[PDB]
Amino acid sequence: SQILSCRETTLSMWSQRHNLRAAGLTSADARLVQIRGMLLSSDIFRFHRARQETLNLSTALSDLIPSCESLGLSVDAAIKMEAANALWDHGEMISSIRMLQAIDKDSSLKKQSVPLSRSDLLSKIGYQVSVARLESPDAIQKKYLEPALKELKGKIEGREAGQVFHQFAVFCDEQLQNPDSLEDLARLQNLKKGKDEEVAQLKSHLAKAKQWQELDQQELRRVEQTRSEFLKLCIENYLLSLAASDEHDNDALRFMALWLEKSEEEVANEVVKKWINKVPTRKFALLMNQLSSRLQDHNTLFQKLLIDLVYRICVDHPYHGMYHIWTGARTRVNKDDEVAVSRQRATDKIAKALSKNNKVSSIWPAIDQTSRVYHALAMDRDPTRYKSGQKVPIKNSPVGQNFLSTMSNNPIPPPTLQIEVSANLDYSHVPMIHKFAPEMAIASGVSAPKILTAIGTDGRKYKQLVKGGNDDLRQDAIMEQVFAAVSELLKLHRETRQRNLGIRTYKVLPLTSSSGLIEFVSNTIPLHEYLMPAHERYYPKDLKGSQCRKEIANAQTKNTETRIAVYRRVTERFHPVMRYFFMEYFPDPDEWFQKRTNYTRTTAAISMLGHVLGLGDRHGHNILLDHKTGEVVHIDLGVAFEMGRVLPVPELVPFRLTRDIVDGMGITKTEGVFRRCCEFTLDALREEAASIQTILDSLRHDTLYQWSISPVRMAKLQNSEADRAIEVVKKKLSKTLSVMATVNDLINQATSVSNLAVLYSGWAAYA
């Protein structure tokens, strides 16, 4: 505000003082720059939601119109549009609409400086008239949206056309999913059914009955034809908006859901056939879990479009599609006939075509051979050759030496390195695997997870878990992708973006239905592995972690009164020590404070986002403490959507807020940074409930995502389902209660002793 106010004084004084200016700078030039600077200062002030400063600017701009008309300037339209924006941002919807309509009626938007296209004005009126319900959605399309597309004059590229096409597609989409229109179609459908049943009873009575029946049919044809036109315009404009600009890129997720719902309706497939080849494939690159799950060999038109799109994605962005094709052709999910012929065979045909073309031919074989040795190394468990906790050189097994040789002959980027999508299609700047460190660690389990290290070409170390056995990493990979998408939504609001509220991601890469390649997050330490030694180092007279766990597990088959009494007796001899994490890794006070502040913000963000998505299984081994930045990282995100309160001893807390987590906050225990960041996160989440619905809808058309926790993992954890889950998520984002009251309720039930006392003992709540 300080810089922008001083810049306003500067530009006005310079426009007033004629003797200070240079020779060839007339007063029209100084005025025009001044106006442009004011317009620039109004966009910035609108983002910050500073109402009084947009009001000041738009008033001071409107006062410059008389002086500007005498200098020979035509700046009425842009200045009146700035006034209309100030009105609309203060709540005057009708006054803003009337003002924009006046600009459009009597003004010459062509012959005037500070240009103003007529199609962005028309679409602006159309949007504001739809929000205010000022006209029926059949006149909005006839007066404002179709004239806009006609003013584009055949231009189908740029941000102007991008705005117009997204405007029109969102409009038509909104007209399809209309509760009134769906009720009317249902009413006409029941009418048709009942009248046909009545005609079936009787077979001038029949004559009039069948005349009424025919008129019902004509009405129903009219309604369905209206809905079909809306569908064509919706899909076509979504595709044209993706091909024009990059402002609207979650239109790829919405087009994809809309197209997989109408896979049979041949009119959608014709429109998609016509317009699909103009979208850059970098828009669909992150949707390969949903695209490769619908692959089938059926010879329809939907499949001839879907296979060609998947093929082009894997050719343009191979490190984003190749592993999905390999997994699809090397993961025999079952020998039984449960459609996977079509999925498993079609992926095999794409793989065969990939190893035939010139762009990707030094890349597919590399990924082929390397994945084969990674999977072989994963599956190889020997209790003698691999002892849990040791550090074995990977040259003594035959698997290890075949792995080393194969990886030396075939250079690829590290499989667990997160590669950003390249608009120019250049993946040469990506570090390849140079060599492997000679040894590999081993963790405790049955099928020993082995931690490899890879030294890349740029000289960095990429550690990896090579996880084998009887787990499902596709659950964890899908949920990691959903959490990353929602955290990307948080960047669009001023309060969460000012605080960098978001989550830390990692990379899960499923190779087969029994193995995968997890990224070992660089310089973290599990929360339980810090807290259990620290509790005995700082309080040598307290109980140990194992004595608390056993004491809590013994009273697991008793009445809630005895469980709560045992829990109070434990935690009276167990004091939190999480505050020492910030005093021994960061002894400098101005680093200590920034690290402690980052921990609170990263904890608050994942607490609210993990409540909205039902995230469970938040014990100490799934939470990592990054001791370079202080932030927390949540891994193992597969038990979501409330699958955790179905377990034998349910997890009935919204998130993890035990006494340690809270102790690592400070001396204002949960008030202050934690409570304010919970409220900013939850406030920005329930203003993006449409986008979160889109993301979960894309999840609904994923054949392979399981919405219940299979007893295999349910026994590994404690020693329509889509419609219910998405409905619960949708009612956690309801604006009925305020954010302050919602957060107060969550923090009450997350720290309650009667809730923490009846949790599973492996969920270390005493800690």
Ligand SMILES: Nc1ncnc2c1ncn2[C@@H]1O[C@H](COP(=O)(O)OP(=O)(O)OP(O)(O)=S)[C@@H](O)[C@H]1O
């Ligand atoms: N991506 C990762 N980055 C860093 N550390 C990880 C990562 N994945 C797992 N770990 C840690 O490495 C170990 C992996 O163990 P897991 O098999 O996930 O669970 P566990 O603690 O070994 O036993 P359970 O089944 O979780 S009770 C734990 O100490 C985790 O904290």
Ligand SMILES: [Mg+2]
């Ligand atoms: Mg784990």
